[PDB]
Amino acid sequence: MQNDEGQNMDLYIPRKCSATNRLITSKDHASVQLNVGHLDESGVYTGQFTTYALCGFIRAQGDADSAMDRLWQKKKAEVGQQ
Amino acid sequence: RTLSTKEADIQMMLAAEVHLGTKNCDFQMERYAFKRRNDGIYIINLGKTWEKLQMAARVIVAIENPQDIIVQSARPYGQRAVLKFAQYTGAHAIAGRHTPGTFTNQLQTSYSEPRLLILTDPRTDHQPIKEAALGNIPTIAFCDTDSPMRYVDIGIPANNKGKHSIGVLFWILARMVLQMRGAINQGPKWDVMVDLFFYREP
Amino acid sequence: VRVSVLNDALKSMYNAEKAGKAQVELRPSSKVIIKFLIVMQKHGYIGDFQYVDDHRVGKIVVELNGRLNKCGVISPRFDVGVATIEGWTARLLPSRQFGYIVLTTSAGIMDHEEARRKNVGGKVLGFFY
Amino acid sequence: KWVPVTKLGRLVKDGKIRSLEQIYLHSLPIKEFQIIDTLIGPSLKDEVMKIMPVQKQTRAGQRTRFKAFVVVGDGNGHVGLGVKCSKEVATAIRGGIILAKLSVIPVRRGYWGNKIGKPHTVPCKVTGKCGSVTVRMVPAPRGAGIVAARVPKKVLQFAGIEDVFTSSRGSTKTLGNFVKATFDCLMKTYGFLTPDFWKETRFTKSPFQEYFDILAKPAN
Amino acid sequence: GRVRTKTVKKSSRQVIERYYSKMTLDFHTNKKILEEVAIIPSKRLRNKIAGFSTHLMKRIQKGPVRGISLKLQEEERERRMDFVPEESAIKTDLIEVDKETLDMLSALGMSDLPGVVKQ
Amino acid sequence: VLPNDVDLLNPPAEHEKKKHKLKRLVQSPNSFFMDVTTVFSHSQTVVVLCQPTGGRARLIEGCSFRRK
Amino acid sequence: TFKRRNGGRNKHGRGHVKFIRCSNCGKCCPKDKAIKRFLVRNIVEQAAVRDVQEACAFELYTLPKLYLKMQYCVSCAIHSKVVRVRSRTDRRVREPPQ
RNA sequence: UCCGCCGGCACCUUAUGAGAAAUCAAAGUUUUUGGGUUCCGGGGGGAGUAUGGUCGCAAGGCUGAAACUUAAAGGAAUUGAC
Ligand SMILES: [K+]
Ligand SMILES: [K+]
Ligand SMILES: [Mg+2]
Ligand SMILES: [Mg+2]
Ligand SMILES: [Mg+2]
Ligand SMILES: [Mg+2]
Ligand SMILES: [Mg+2]
Ligand SMILES: [Mg+2]
Ligand SMILES: [Zn+2]
Incomplete structure (x- = not known):
């Protein structure tokens, strides 16, 4: 990754699945990146969102729905969304 | 007394039998089912159904261009709701049969590249769901108790069979998307009538 | 019959990690398994694991963090002197930059990097990376 | 055009x-x-x-x-x-x-030993399979060259790999599977989660989301 | 046999799509319209197209067809669907629920809803 | 329940109830003693208060038994 | 190449099954492998029911039925068209036809 | 009749797996190669033959070669022709 001097030696840093932590390769066309919008006190979209990345492996297993639900149930309690 | 937005929607969903599931429950839908009665029919927890509707609405509003959202149904009962849902939310509705190669064949006329996909029933809409997994297209689907969860990112636990259930679900979802945009006033009421979403037989 | 409790413990973790599970139960438990886990935990390959006392052998629940590629035992437990550690690493590890071979030495259970620092040999228990 | x-x-x-x-x-x-x-x-x-x-x-x-x-x-x-x-x-x-x-x-590239100069070999042991053909690549020290048959060697040269050790099992005379197996392990160089990738992901907007307005407007 | 080929069928549908108003139910009148609004190289081909188009006109009178898209006809169908009764089919009051359903609402703390009533 | 929707260390009390006695997180017998003179729920001996069977001993309707 | 998961018969968790004799040729065939058909029909053909009924000597009488259980070997079942050769996909369908 | 637990003969769907494929919920957890242990194979023939030993009343069983010969034999699947 980083040379002895410090310069980066990687073309890019692949994303990691938010549920399984697996790397997402350039040909993983079943992987999807999802955005969940943030609301205000009134309940109107404020232009802010939280991003989630899912690999094709977990989505093919059918566990994406459960994984997304658990991740959102935790994230919303941290950013004040409810 | 005054009913909150969640209570009013749950009351509306009860009248439409949105909570009545199939006699069989998929192992990945058990987390949404509440209890099974002696009749063998599973009862969907409407409390969780409303929460998933809110989560789906948050994803929809995050789409800058509504035209990138495609909502479609295969069964006739949902062909009316999808058209009305796209009318108010600005999405792109495709009612009828999905043409294979829509999302993969770049040289045919019907080629499209949606950012989000909405479906009424994964079991009947298997073709678009299967084809959406070749283009990094996230999918939202209304899933019944016996609905497969493969390649489904957000599954809304609801009865996607009855004509009333399908119409109410899209009516509520359309209202939530507009409310989160500030286009319409908050609350459980909407100037649009739900009957516009119900299936109109010949 | 159960021959190597360590193999069952590591095999269960490896299968669970590939399936994407967050927790996995190891039964039976042993002080060799616990010390093996501690080595993995110190290098940030597993999260927090909890030992349950059942008055017979106990049980362990291990929290997974998705960083573990593979973990397995080496059977039989061959003797490995300090001079022969280099050969084993060239065989079992992906590269010369990460991955640890767990050895049981007279100074205790430790990874091969620690064994070189203490200049102590022993026997191979397993590996992970 | x-x-x-x-x-x-x-x-x-x-x-x-x-x-x-x-x-x-x-x-x-x-x-x-x-x-x-x-x-x-x-x-x-x-x-x-x-x-x-x-x-x-x-x-x-x-x-x-x-x-x-x-x-x-x-x-x-x-x-x-x-x-x-x-x-x-x-x-x-x-x-x-x-x-x-x-x-x-x-194709991800790494260093056999010390990180001196530009990357020259595969970062880890990687294997690819197609049909019965399995091709393995092991990191090699600088100057070792590409120790591989003609078909893998040509692919590795175009991928920028300078030094690597290779071994093969199966019907390598089936060129279609031999070349594909070599190409199969090259794409896995970015699939192996090394410790340097443990850092939490920092997501960025996709090109479609970033340039939605440009894409929305029809091109004529 | 007397099966019309794609040339006859395809041409007939196109004529009806953009000249439905001009077309009539009479073959003799229709074949004169084709000469005015189309270039058919041969007389025999023109007669076949006129006859099949006249057959399609009879089909349209009784109901819609598959391969012909009449824009004016489509608009009529849209208006009928948009019509809905003033009374909603979903009754918020007098909601029939089962014992399990009532317990499901109790877990949510919504056992005080007006409409919900046991069967 | 899916593996990731359940906690192995703190399973629901109802879930452990229906699990096999030997497969629970901690082994627990399903038997118990009762008064009537303590009688084992799965007694293999004729007490006629209880009649041994393939499982729990068949108790007599007349007398009333209190679990302990 | 293995053509069928069941091996052409219906035997699980047992070693030997006594054979039956084909109703057509008498060939020995294991009972679990033989094609079995239970034929129930009137003892009088439909072409003669009217004549027999008119000649009945009783005011009320129900014509008895003829029950015959037929057990065929594979060769006779195919030749007699009791069963037909099906495509690879259709071989797995076990439900009786319409 | 309904719910569940243990054990057994099986079946159905599915790939995140495996395989040359047929196919397999094991024939999976294998070049990211190691739970324990027994038997057993090394191109096709000659050949389960010759010989020696051993068992059997016999029929034969068990054990078991070489000379020599040969560039294929064979497995799965594909298109044709029949
Ligand atoms: K049979
Ligand atoms: K059973
Ligand atoms: Mg054959
Ligand atoms: Mg048996
Ligand atoms: Mg036998
Ligand atoms: Mg199968
Ligand atoms: Mg091996
Ligand atoms: Mg040989
Ligand atoms: Zn026969």
Whole structure:
């Protein structure tokens, strides 16, 4: 990754699945990146969102729905969304 | 007394039998089912159904261009709701049969590249769901108790069979998307009538 | 019959990690398994694991963090002197930059990097990376 | 000329996207070879691996079609493999070149020992399988060269790999599977989660989301 | 046999799509319209197209067809669907629920809803 | 329940109730003693207060038993 | 190449099954492998019911039925068209036809 | 009749797996190669033959070669022709 001097030696840093932590390769066309919008006190979209990345492996297993639900149930309690 | 937005929607969903599931429950839908009665029919927890509707609405509003959202149904009962849902939310509705190669064949006329996909029933809409997994297209689907969860990112636990259930679900979802945009006033009421979403037989 | 409790413990973790599970139960438990886990935990390959006392052998629940590629035992437990550690690493590890071979030495259970620092040999228990 | 029909084609045609890594990050499929010619076009170099005639038995005779294996790569971490079958040798080669570009992948490179100079070998042990053919790649010290057969060696050279040890099992004489197996392990170089990738991911907007307004407006 | 080929069928549908108003139910009148609004190289081909188009006109009178898209006809169908009764089919009051359903609402703390009533 | 929707260390009390006695997180017998003179729920001996069977001993309707 | 998961018969968790004799040719065939058909029909053909009924000597009488259980070997079942050769996909369908 | 637990003969769907494929919920957890242990194979023939030993009333069983010969034999699947 980083040379002895410090310069980066990687073309890019692949994303990691938010549920399984697996790397997402350039040909993983079943992987999807999802955005969940943030609301205000009134309940109107404020232009802010939280991003989630899912690999094709977990989505093919059918566990994406459960994984997304658990991740959102935790994230919303941290950013004040409810 | 005054009913909150969640209570009013749950009351509306009860009248439409949105909570009545199939006699069989998929192992990945058990987390949404509440209890099974002696009749063998599973009862969907409407409390969780409303929460998933809110989560789906948050994803929809995050789409800058509504035209990138495609909502479609295969069964006739949902062909009316999808058209009305796209009318108010600005999405792109495709009612009828999905043409294979829509999302993969770049040289045919019907080629499209949606950012989000909405479906009424994964079991009947298997073709678009299967084809959406070749283009990094996230999918939202209304899933019944016996609905497969493969390649489904957000599954809304609801009865996607009855004509009333399908119409109410899209009516509520359309209202939530507009409310989160500030286009319409908050609350459980909407100037649009739900009957516009119900299936109109010949 | 159960021959190597360590193999069952590591095999269960490896299968669970590939399936994407967050927790996995190891039964039976042993002080060799616990010390093996501690080595993995110190290098940030597993999260927090909890030992349950059942008055017979106990049980362990291990929290997974998705960083573990593979973990397995080496059977039989061959003797490995300090001079022969280099050969084993060239065989079992992906590269010369990460991955640890767990050895049981007279100074205790430790990874091969620690064994070189203490200049102590022993026997191979397993590996992970 | 080129009239893009996909979202990436317009962005690449417009110039919003200027690197393949920005596409690889979001794992977006590439269907138009003009995109590859616009980003790493001048640095690419195609080479025909083999012409394989295949025959189909017919009432009048045997239908002979020609199958061409083409490998492309800039020699700096990008390589592609394309195979097309056609009734003419020239037509097969031209189509194979197009297919090779569409399958270009990023190849991760590392250091055998000390991180001195540019990366020269694979970062870890990687194996690829196609049919019965399995190709293994082990990191090798600088100057060791590419210790591999002709078919893997050609692919590795186009991928920018300078030194690596290789071993093979299975029917390597099946060139189609031998080259594909070599290409299979190269794409796995970015799939292995090393400790340096343990850092939490920092997501960024996809090109479609970033340039929604440009894509929304029809192109005329 | 007397099966019309794609040339006859395809041409007939196109004529009806953009000249439905001009077309009539009479073959003799229709074949004169084709000469005015189309270039048919041969007389025999023109007669076949006129006859099949006249057959399609009879089909349209009784109901819609598959391969012909009449824009004016489509608009009529849209208006009928948009019509809905003033009374909603979903009754918020007098909601029939089962014992399990009532317990499901109790877990949510919504056992005080007006409409919900046991069967 | 899916593996990731359940906690192995703190399973629901109802879930452990229906699990096999030997497969619970901690082994627990399903038997118990009762008064009537303590009688084992799965007694293998004739007490006629209880009649041994393949499982729990068949108790007599007349007398009333209190679990302990 | 293995053509069927069941091996052409219906035997699980047992070693030997006594054979039966084909109703057509008498060939020995294991009972679990033989094609079995239970034919129930009137003892009088439909072409003669009217004549027999008119000649009945009783005011009320129900014509008895003829029950015959037929057990065929594979060769006779195919030749007699009791069963037909099906495509690879259709071989797995075990439900009786319409 | 309904719910569940243990054990057994099986079946159905599915790939995140495996395989040359047929196919397999094991024939999976294998070049990211190691839970324990027994038997057993090394191109096709000659050949389960010759010989020696051993068992059997016999029929034969068990054990078991070489000379020499040969560039294929064979497995799965595809298109034709029949
Ligand atoms: K049979
Ligand atoms: K059972
Ligand atoms: Mg055969
Ligand atoms: Mg048995
Ligand atoms: Mg036998
Ligand atoms: Mg199967
Ligand atoms: Mg091995
Ligand atoms: Mg041999
Ligand atoms: Zn027979």
